[model samples]
Target: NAVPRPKLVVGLVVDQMRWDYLYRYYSKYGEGGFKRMLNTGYSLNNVHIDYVPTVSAIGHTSIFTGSVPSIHGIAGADWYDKELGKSVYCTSDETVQPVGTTSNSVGQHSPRNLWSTTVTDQLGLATNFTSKVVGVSLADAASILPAGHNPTGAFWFDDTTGKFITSTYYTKELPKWVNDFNNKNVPAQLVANGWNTLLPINQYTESSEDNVEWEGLLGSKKTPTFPYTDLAKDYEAKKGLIRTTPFGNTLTLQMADAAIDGNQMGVDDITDFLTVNLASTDYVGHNFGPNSIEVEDTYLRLDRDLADFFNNLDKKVGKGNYLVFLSADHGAAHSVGFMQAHKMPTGFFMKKEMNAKLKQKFGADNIIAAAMNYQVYFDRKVLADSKLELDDVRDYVMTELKKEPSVLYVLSTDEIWESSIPEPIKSRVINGYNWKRSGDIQIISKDGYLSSKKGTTHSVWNSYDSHIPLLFMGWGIKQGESNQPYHMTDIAPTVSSLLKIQFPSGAVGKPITEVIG
Candidate 1:
């Protein structure tokens, strides 16, 4: 009914979402949230982020910029910086001071590290910076990274102070619009409602009991489940903590509404980009693996939230005047404890075991230094002086690493060059490998062996970790679903096509042909 280009584009990145979750937790899903998106949106059944170590930083950068870790340069959430001689969190800026909240330490956020030009950046540039760009989330990484390098403002909730704040890197003073938006105090209302079962307690048969074996203690509660009562104080103490519960999603939507109302998004001629990261899912999914009651409830609640969000779009922007897409930063793994109970072989990589043995055998500590994201950087300085052939060491480490039950494959940096992964994957792996920044060895764990003793994590090459969902709805979208295989890189191109604009900088993917008419 309306022209193709929409007035606003909403990019929703649900953190650490598993692709199978839609069906696995179906019954508990309320009529509103996930189901509504599925019913209205053109679902891409085979969308995956085609890069290594699917962490928050990489996902945000790649999804927004339409570039890979190879080009975008956000190798992981935090990586060993050779220059700093320590791990550096992505989006950290030395210049800016914190505003709008107290607690001095965490205000260190900025887009100084993001290398590629984001699609949102292009929209701003093309419109001569008139098109408002705002990013919001409970987590700093979630907020700052997606607003691109130069947005009107990118704000995040500070757990230390019950308020939203940002570093001066984005602005000198919070705009009156932002100040007005903050004055709303949406988080306070979310807690008053309190979190309960999205479905009746009896009907949530798809998930394990509230305090199940796969779940761990969080807040003051001994285990994770519905009625996470102890978290109220935690939520109040650190406003950001709500981000782990469904309330986090609720507050995010509230802020988003404020953003929409204050900015008059979708009311103007030029398109605006609003990037919001729904972070509680990742937090909940991590504490209680995908099978826990908390996970099921979170999705159900999120489904309802989605319905409300979509309905708001229909009213605010007119039915055909806006476009919205949703996807995950990465998928999570099965908990080690859960996998063990199911007779599945799962365990964290005993880096201590590997490091100790190698230290005795090679006579060095920190020999296998971790650098960048996933690559294990060897102490080349030590290896060289020993007259040890790096080739022999590579083979030895690969051979030794293969002996572990959790390891599926170990590809040395050298092997990634001469290796036999498929074409684009092979090239992508090679391109992603930075000789100076990357590790000497790349490790791939078994399917369920996630990174910790308690919570699960993404970043490995297992299907559970790499697979994710991508759904597009409203505006120029056609109502249907496609099981066609596609990469996360394709999303930006799809947006570019719908808007009749050029692809984002560092674009390696073509527009997905299946969904777009």
Candidate 2:
């Protein structure tokens, strides 16, 4: 057993961060933010997501649980529930009611669908349920999945009310500290002065022109350029507009400070766990591709936010009393338009178009499910009731799907493990396949091509979506860098080994021994 444990373990999962973002803006970053962690922490230069459909819920769940979707049972952001005969979100729990907001839909969420324990859950179990674990994020799944089955609380932002709210699963009422933080009105304060770049617009050398055709416009803006003067006005009418701006990140970090203060996170002998997901990166990345100036400014502002957060931790929890790991839920692809304009092979595979063609071939109303996560799912109940042969249906879909120009390959779920595809893609398919939750077949798009109609998306098995950032700092971590390849699954066991606690059940990854002494 270890004699000393850090008073707190903090997990920071930046949504949609690719490994390249670390160095792309490296020189521009202040030393106290990303630079501080890289300089003072152990950096893994070659960490890759070992699964397909690399959505937010699966990414966060994979980090905390040290397991894949096949075992942990969170297949995607939303999956067609075979049991329910409809698609359901990863965190939806109808039994729980809203606590901090009046809206019922956004507040109804929990970790009930998660099949395995998380590192946070194991921490509570190791400490006999005394350690407080809290999760906060703009996205419900990002917050709930990382905190695991039971925690002190899991809170998410409610756009309608502009407050951080929780479901009844964790508490019947909002805590005093949260109520106080909500009363402070952090969201409005951050967005009150509409966003402008931290640095002058001319200095954003890393990004493309502001008025690019591929970029999506913010509220009431004809161009995607900065100096969003209308943001403050738009925010008054629709508070969710802030999500596409960098100020959303500021709001989340503010709440992180409140969680530490309210829960007394690091003040006791038993260690506490706090899982924070900075989700605006994903939102911003989705609106404007990685090459846009809007994205570059968001990262620049986030660096300063990180610096402020670290300084607060230094004052409250002491510099060396806590452990922190920063990573991403998933990476994203460049926009199809950007790729096509730059003379790369890229196109959009309209799922509806493909689905319509399939219906013409297979017969009308045969394809029962909507196109989702790059896989076409058919209604199994319909097939069974009609006494249709499963193999015949699979064979027909696979053959037709393979004919699509944008499609690179198609593999039936049963053959994924033993498919003749290349190494990384083959392994990713095998790791991501959840028999009960996944579709009957898998669709692999050509590099740079995507299924999305707008900016860009993840969930593909390619490096653009699979390769993500992973860094460890404070307490047991040593300052160094490793270029060796490691899987996202290794994070949980590495932390478990560092803390001298049991790894989460169903964990398949071996601890990254080089990270610990």
lDDT of 1 by residue, 1-517 (tens): 5444789999999898888888897766677667767887788888877877777788888888788876777777777666565667787777788887655667878888777888888888777798889998888888887888888788888777556788888776766766776676667767765567766776778776666565766666664656766665666666666777898888788788778887888897678889999999998887787877778788888888888988888888887788888888889887888788789877876446666777787776666555335566666665666656667666767888778777766788777867755554565566555554556777766666766476677776556876788888777788788888888888888887887776788888778766675
Global fold similarity of model 1 (TM-score): 0.92
TM-score of 2: 0.97
Q: Give the Cα lDDT of each candidate.
A: 0.76, 0.87
Task: Please give the distance, in angstroms, between residue 178's alpha carbon in candidate 1 and its true position after superposition.
Answer: 3.1
Clash number by candidate, in order = 4, 0
Please give, for residues 32-81, the per-residue lDDT of candidate 2 as tens digits.
99999999999999899998888769999999999999999998988887
Clashes of 1: 4
Model 2 per-residue lDDT at 136: 93
